[PDB]
Design a protein around this motif. Sequence first.
Motif, PDB file in Angstrom:
ATOM      1  N   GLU A   1      -9.341 -44.269  55.145  1.00  0.00           N
ATOM      2  CA  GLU A   1     -10.291 -44.297  54.038  1.00  0.00           C
ATOM      3  C   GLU A   1     -11.404 -43.269  54.247  1.00  0.00           C
ATOM      4  OE1 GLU A   1      -9.594 -46.081  51.471  1.00  0.00           O
ATOM      5  OE2 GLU A   1     -11.565 -45.989  50.288  1.00  0.00           O
ATOM      6  N   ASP A   2     -11.944 -43.289  55.465  1.00  0.00           N
ATOM      7  CA  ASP A   2     -12.936 -42.328  55.903  1.00  0.00           C
ATOM      8  C   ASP A   2     -12.342 -40.894  55.797  1.00  0.00           C
ATOM      9  OD1 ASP A   2     -15.447 -41.540  57.186  1.00  0.00           O
ATOM     10  OD2 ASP A   2     -14.585 -41.649  59.120  1.00  0.00           O
ATOM     11  N   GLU A   3     -11.084 -40.659  56.224  1.00  0.00           N
ATOM     12  CA  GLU A   3     -10.504 -39.324  56.299  1.00  0.00           C
ATOM     13  C   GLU A   3     -10.315 -38.753  54.923  1.00  0.00           C
ATOM     14  OE1 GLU A   3      -6.895 -39.664  58.738  1.00  0.00           O
ATOM     15  OE2 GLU A   3      -8.243 -39.490  60.542  1.00  0.00           O
ATOM     16  N   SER A   4      -9.891 -39.695  54.083  1.00  0.00           N
ATOM     17  CA  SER A   4      -9.543 -39.409  52.713  1.00  0.00           C
ATOM     18  C   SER A   4     -10.819 -39.008  51.957  1.00  0.00           C
ATOM     19  CB  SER A   4      -8.902 -40.660  52.143  1.00  0.00           C
ATOM     20  OG  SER A   4      -8.437 -40.455  50.809  1.00  0.00           O
ATOM     21  N   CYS A   5     -11.885 -39.838  52.112  1.00  0.00           N
ATOM     22  CA  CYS A   5     -13.162 -39.494  51.540  1.00  0.00           C
ATOM     23  C   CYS A   5     -13.659 -38.119  51.931  1.00  0.00           C
ATOM     24  CB  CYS A   5     -14.278 -40.419  51.955  1.00  0.00           C
ATOM     25  SG  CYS A   5     -15.769 -40.097  50.958  1.00  0.00           S
ATOM     26  N   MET A   6     -13.605 -37.816  53.210  1.00  0.00           N
ATOM     27  CA  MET A   6     -13.985 -36.499  53.707  1.00  0.00           C
ATOM     28  C   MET A   6     -13.137 -35.373  53.157  1.00  0.00           C
ATOM     29  SD  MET A   6     -15.263 -36.952  57.768  1.00  0.00           S
ATOM     30  CE  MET A   6     -14.081 -38.206  58.263  1.00  0.00           C
ATOM     31  N   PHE A   7     -11.869 -35.629  52.927  1.00  0.00           N
ATOM     32  CA  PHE A   7     -10.922 -34.604  52.447  1.00  0.00           C
ATOM     33  C   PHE A   7     -11.308 -34.290  50.996  1.00  0.00           C
ATOM     34  CE2 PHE A   7      -6.132 -34.308  50.949  1.00  0.00           C
ATOM     35  CZ  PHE A   7      -6.215 -32.908  50.776  1.00  0.00           C
ATOM     36  N   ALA A   8     -11.648 -35.341  50.256  1.00  0.00           N
ATOM     37  CA  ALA A   8     -12.217 -35.144  48.909  1.00  0.00           C
ATOM     38  C   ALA A   8     -13.377 -34.167  48.936  1.00  0.00           C
ATOM     39  CB  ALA A   8     -12.718 -36.449  48.318  1.00  0.00           C
ATOM     40  N   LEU A   9     -14.325 -34.430  49.866  1.00  0.00           N
ATOM     41  CA  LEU A   9     -15.535 -33.617  49.992  1.00  0.00           C
ATOM     42  C   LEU A   9     -15.183 -32.208  50.413  1.00  0.00           C
ATOM     43  CD1 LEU A   9     -17.740 -36.320  51.711  1.00  0.00           C
ATOM     44  CD2 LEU A   9     -17.946 -35.560  49.305  1.00  0.00           C
ATOM     45  N   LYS A  10     -14.248 -32.097  51.370  1.00  0.00           N
ATOM     46  CA  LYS A  10     -13.799 -30.775  51.795  1.00  0.00           C
ATOM     47  C   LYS A  10     -13.335 -29.947  50.586  1.00  0.00           C
ATOM     48  CE  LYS A  10     -10.550 -28.486  54.703  1.00  0.00           C
ATOM     49  NZ  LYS A  10     -11.436 -28.113  55.850  1.00  0.00           N
ATOM     50  N   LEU A  11     -12.527 -30.573  49.675  1.00  0.00           N
ATOM     51  CA  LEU A  11     -11.975 -29.811  48.582  1.00  0.00           C
ATOM     52  C   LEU A  11     -13.073 -29.392  47.659  1.00  0.00           C
ATOM     53  CD1 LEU A  11      -9.009 -32.169  47.898  1.00  0.00           C
ATOM     54  CD2 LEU A  11      -8.826 -29.729  48.726  1.00  0.00           C
ATOM     55  N   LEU A  12     -13.948 -30.345  47.298  1.00  0.00           N
ATOM     56  CA  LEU A  12     -15.089 -30.014  46.426  1.00  0.00           C
ATOM     57  C   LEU A  12     -16.040 -28.967  47.044  1.00  0.00           C
ATOM     58  CD1 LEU A  12     -16.145 -33.582  45.413  1.00  0.00           C
ATOM     59  CD2 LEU A  12     -15.000 -31.961  43.919  1.00  0.00           C
ATOM     60  N   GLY A  13     -16.032 -28.682  48.374  1.00  0.00           N
ATOM     61  CA  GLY A  13     -17.009 -27.710  48.852  1.00  0.00           C
ATOM     62  C   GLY A  13     -16.433 -26.410  49.445  1.00  0.00           C
ATOM     63  N   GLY A  14     -15.148 -26.127  49.216  1.00  0.00           N
ATOM     64  CA  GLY A  14     -14.404 -25.044  49.843  1.00  0.00           C
ATOM     65  C   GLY A  14     -14.896 -23.631  49.484  1.00  0.00           C
ATOM     66  N   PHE A  15     -15.893 -23.532  48.555  1.00  0.00           N
ATOM     67  CA  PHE A  15     -16.600 -22.288  48.247  1.00  0.00           C
ATOM     68  C   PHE A  15     -17.589 -21.830  49.320  1.00  0.00           C
ATOM     69  CE2 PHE A  15     -19.111 -25.778  46.550  1.00  0.00           C
ATOM     70  CZ  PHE A  15     -20.348 -25.501  47.074  1.00  0.00           C
ATOM     71  N   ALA A  16     -18.012 -22.763  50.162  1.00  0.00           N
ATOM     72  CA  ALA A  16     -19.042 -22.421  51.144  1.00  0.00           C
ATOM     73  C   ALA A  16     -18.608 -21.274  52.091  1.00  0.00           C
ATOM     74  CB  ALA A  16     -19.472 -23.648  51.902  1.00  0.00           C
TER      75      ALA A  16
END
Lengths: 365, 363
Positions: free
Chosen positions: A8-23
């Motif tokens: 659940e934790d990994e999945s949440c973070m993966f969501a965030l990773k995708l939304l911030g991949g412009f950095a």
Amino acid sequence: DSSARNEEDESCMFALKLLGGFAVPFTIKAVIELGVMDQLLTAERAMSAEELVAAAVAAQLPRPEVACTMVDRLLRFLASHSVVRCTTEVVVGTDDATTTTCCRRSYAASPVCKWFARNGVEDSVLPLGMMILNKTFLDSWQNITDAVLEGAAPFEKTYGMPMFEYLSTNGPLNTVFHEAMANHSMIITKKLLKFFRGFEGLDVLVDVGGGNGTTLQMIRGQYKNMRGINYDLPHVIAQAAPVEGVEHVGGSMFDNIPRGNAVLLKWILHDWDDKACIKILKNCYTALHVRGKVIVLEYVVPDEPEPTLAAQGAFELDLTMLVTFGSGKERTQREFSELAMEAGFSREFKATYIFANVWALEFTK
Amino acid sequence: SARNEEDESCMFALKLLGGFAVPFTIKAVIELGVMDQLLTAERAMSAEELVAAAVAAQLPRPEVACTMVDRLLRFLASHSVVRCTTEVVVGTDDATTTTCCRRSYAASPVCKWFARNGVEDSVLPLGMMILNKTFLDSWQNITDAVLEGAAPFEKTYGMPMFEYLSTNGPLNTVFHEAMANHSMIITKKLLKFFRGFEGLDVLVDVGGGNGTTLQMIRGQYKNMRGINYDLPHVIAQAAPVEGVEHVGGSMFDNIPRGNAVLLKWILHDWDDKACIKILKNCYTALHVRGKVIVLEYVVPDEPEPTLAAQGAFELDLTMLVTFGSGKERTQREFSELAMEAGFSREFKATYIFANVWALEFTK
Ligand SMILES: Oc1ccc(/C=C/c2cc(O)cc(O)c2)cc1
Ligand SMILES: Oc1ccc(/C=C/c2cc(O)cc(O)c2)cc1
């Protein structure tokens, strides 16, 4: 709450990773525009943020300790993504120009960073990068939604006209675009000369949309007895120097194409829909004699969305064409063959891998 | 071989330069309604299907919209965001971009975190702020900002973010909704996994808004009173809540008294010096054996190439862009803030969720 909890934790973070991949991209741009990336590339030892700002930036800085800590933090982030190597040394005092009291970090280029070299196209994709990351194209991408609804190109939705048109009204962006295309052209054409055996024994060769770095000069360079014809629009041809063994011709590729033993279309087709492509290729059919060939320098998307670096890059190019052109698009092997067959070409197809997702695809008459 | 290595390396470079593509393609897929449809659908669904279901609006060129959506989802699938199955067509389909081949798409597990109607387990509101163009335009001004030793936000808009939020209601709403979003999730996981609210008579939440957070907590510890501290502008608009006094004021001046103080995503907005002002005010506020509870990411001591580390350094950069001197902190650095501000050499760290820890300092 063992293992459920981590999933659940990994999945949440993966969501965030995708939304911030412009950095990653935007941080790379800024490290390049400071000259910090060039300094990494000229370096023979690891170098701290302080050292790299002093080397890259000649100007007196209004807050030098803050500029250093900021660069440190940018490079710390790149390092976490394996773009730079990072080593850590002990203090011996208190140094203020790293973001950690105990510990100064020193950075060194990864192999990959050579492709960000500013100096010259000595094996760099930076001018191409400068286009990929320009304000004007990036603004388009944030306006895909409304463009989809209208069935329009996000570029056009956002600037109220086709990119090409826009380029003639804005010289700064025009420069960027031509520099990007010359950039890509140079790398690709150099590699072609090493790997590709489709230019041998051809008496005339027509280059569509070139002229000025010509590309034909490089080729003709290694096939001395090959003559070249540089086809592009009159506005573009009115600015071409006489070049040894190269006729320059002006005109629209939708109306006609000049006669040779082969025609070359680098990153032309992918700008246009199948209907427009078939007009173009027909004009190549009527240009060519029998036994002659069209040579297509394009990416080739796989039949399916495979999660490989190669695949992802091609679908990404597809989306760039989407944003830029709308109906411009990337194509499979199959799809290209089908275009060739509509436009009259035989069921004889050749594909040779060049470099960086680009293939040479050959159709014969 | 050095032809192949060179090939890979070049493609790597291009990957790095274009990694915004995923986020912006996800954004679009969400704003079209297509992601919600994937999330509710019972079987795989084509672009045509999904556009008909997601888009109420009269479509002037419907076949083009569909092929465009197909292409978006084809790209997401290549990144394992959607699942993609491909069939032969027995007829003429021009509402997927391949003649031969219709694709159908399904949600990957990850996608649930993009759910609208915000429910339980979605970070979409926070997503909408991550990807807001007002915020993203600042990242195009890092170069010039660094030179001046300024925050890119201020380079771009000529003032600090929080002041800027008073000018733009729409972006204010985005920001508040995002913070409330993440606070809600984090608070729910806290109540599951964190034991440090046991036995607290008063809790002071600093910069916790309308007291939603204190409400949730007090909901599980019924004998615990809260005090909701924020600016008077924020407080004069906050609804009464059972067992919560709302106090208006600056955390730089002082802080209401209690057994513990909560600082969620406060410290990382500020430089060392401001943080030490805030924590000192907390030290004086707290009665003895009192604690500060800090809810923040904790960067590792080194840039380790891990998914978790990456996400914390990414947050670091967001602080850098947004505030300049705002920043993410290592355990050691947090500890030094606490020791400057008077707290003991005693430190407790409980992992919560999504890279956020509860760090406790004792008076
Ligand atoms: O993965 C993520 C990416 C970005 C963020 C943003 C957080 C944030 C927190 C603040 O207190 C102020 C702010 O302007 C932004 C969080 C998670
Ligand atoms: O990683 C990337 C690799 C290549 C490209 C190419 C872009 C491009 C953009 C245009 O507007 C026209 C064009 O003919 C090519 C962009 C990103």
